[PDB]
Scaffold this motif. Structure first.
Motif, short mmCIF file in Angstrom:
data_model
loop_
_atom_site.label_atom_id
_atom_site.label_comp_id
_atom_site.label_asym_id
_atom_site.label_seq_id
_atom_site.Cartn_x
_atom_site.Cartn_y
_atom_site.Cartn_z
N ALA A 39 57.18 55.87 67.70
CA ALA A 39 58.19 56.01 66.65
C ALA A 39 58.90 57.34 66.85
CB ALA A 39 57.53 55.95 65.27
N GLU A 70 61.34 56.84 69.62
CA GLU A 70 62.44 56.03 69.11
C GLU A 70 63.46 56.83 68.31
OE1 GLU A 70 61.12 52.18 70.57
OE2 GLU A 70 62.96 53.34 70.19
N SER A 71 62.98 57.83 67.58
CA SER A 71 63.85 58.68 66.78
C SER A 71 64.52 59.75 67.64
CB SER A 71 63.05 59.36 65.67
OG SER A 71 62.17 60.33 66.22
N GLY A 72 64.06 59.90 68.87
CA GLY A 72 64.64 60.89 69.76
C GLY A 72 64.13 62.28 69.49
N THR A 112 62.64 64.64 59.82
CA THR A 112 63.28 65.05 61.07
C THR A 112 64.43 66.03 60.85
OG1 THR A 112 64.82 63.17 61.03
CG2 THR A 112 62.72 62.85 62.16
N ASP A 130 66.95 60.54 64.44
CA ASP A 130 67.12 59.59 63.34
C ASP A 130 65.78 59.08 62.81
OD1 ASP A 130 67.87 57.60 61.59
OD2 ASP A 130 68.79 56.32 63.11
N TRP A 167 65.17 56.86 60.65
CA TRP A 167 65.16 55.42 60.46
C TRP A 167 64.74 54.62 61.68
CZ3 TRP A 167 64.82 53.23 55.90
CH2 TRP A 167 65.20 54.00 54.79
N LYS A 168 64.87 55.19 62.87
CA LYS A 168 64.44 54.50 64.09
C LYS A 168 62.91 54.49 64.07
CE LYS A 168 68.53 53.81 65.61
NZ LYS A 168 69.02 54.53 66.83
N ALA A 169 62.32 55.57 63.56
CA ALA A 169 60.86 55.69 63.46
C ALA A 169 60.36 54.69 62.42
CB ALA A 169 60.47 57.11 63.05
N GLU A 214 61.71 51.89 61.53
CA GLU A 214 61.83 50.55 62.09
C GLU A 214 60.71 50.19 63.03
OE1 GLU A 214 64.57 48.96 60.45
OE2 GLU A 214 62.98 47.53 60.97
N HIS A 215 60.36 51.09 63.93
CA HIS A 215 59.27 50.81 64.84
C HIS A 215 57.96 50.68 64.07
CE1 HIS A 215 56.69 50.77 68.32
NE2 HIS A 215 55.97 51.73 67.77
#
Lengths: 117, 117
Positions: free
Chosen positions: B32, B35-37, B81, B87, B89-91, B93-94
């Motif tokens: 995650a 995914e969030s970068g 973050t 982001d 929200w990418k975390a 989502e995963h």
């Protein structure tokens, strides 16, 4: 009423020296954990360059975190505790004194509300 | 408009097997983060008897934390973050997919609002 209590706090106009002292911040963070009545499982603190400290104190089922921006005298604090015997506000009080914040904003969240889980 | 974005999330009806798997949780929490970068600073996960997993992924100036209650299929998740390029929200989502949560509640905080500091 819920598994845990969580304080999301914004600390403003703090003692910038203390905010950039990774050693002192760790000491005050574990001491805050002691004051709340929590048992520390582990803790990890890191220094951010040019300025700033980040640390987390893992306690029983929850945590205490802090992230500082000495350049702005600001600190993002989180006091998430589980169980009636542990009061996060005791941690808040110690940190407020330790960081010499002049203005604070705190929101208290209920984590794991019994009627929800 | 703020130093950081913080998601306070309640995950309900999760895969109880996954919630009690300290090895899988660490894996998914790190994924995650990717995914969030975000950039991982340190990682620490622990499993408490009889059930329960607590873990924190310290990232650049912030954190990703999770505390599970397998017996309730509940998980307390925090995705804090900093940076326009990371982001939370990418975390989210995963993690929502990995834990198979069927119901979620999320509060988004702006930590270190520019007009406050």
């Amino acid at each position: 009423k819920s598994l845990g209590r969580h304080l999301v706090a914004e600390f403003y106009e703090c003692d910038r020296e203390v905010l950039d002292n990774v050693q002192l911040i760790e000491q005050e963070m574990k001491q805050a954990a002691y004051e709340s009545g929590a048992t520390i499982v582990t803790s990890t603190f890191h220094r951010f360059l040019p300025y700033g400290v980040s640390g987390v104190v893992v306690i029983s089922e929850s945590h205490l975190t802090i992230h500082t921006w000495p350049e702005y005298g600001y600190a993002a604090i989180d006091l998430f505790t589980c169980g009636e015997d542990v009061d996060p506000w005791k941690a808040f009080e110690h940190l407020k004194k330790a960081l010499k914040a002049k203005r604070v904003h705190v929101v208290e969240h209920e984590r794991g509300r019994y009627d929800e889980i």
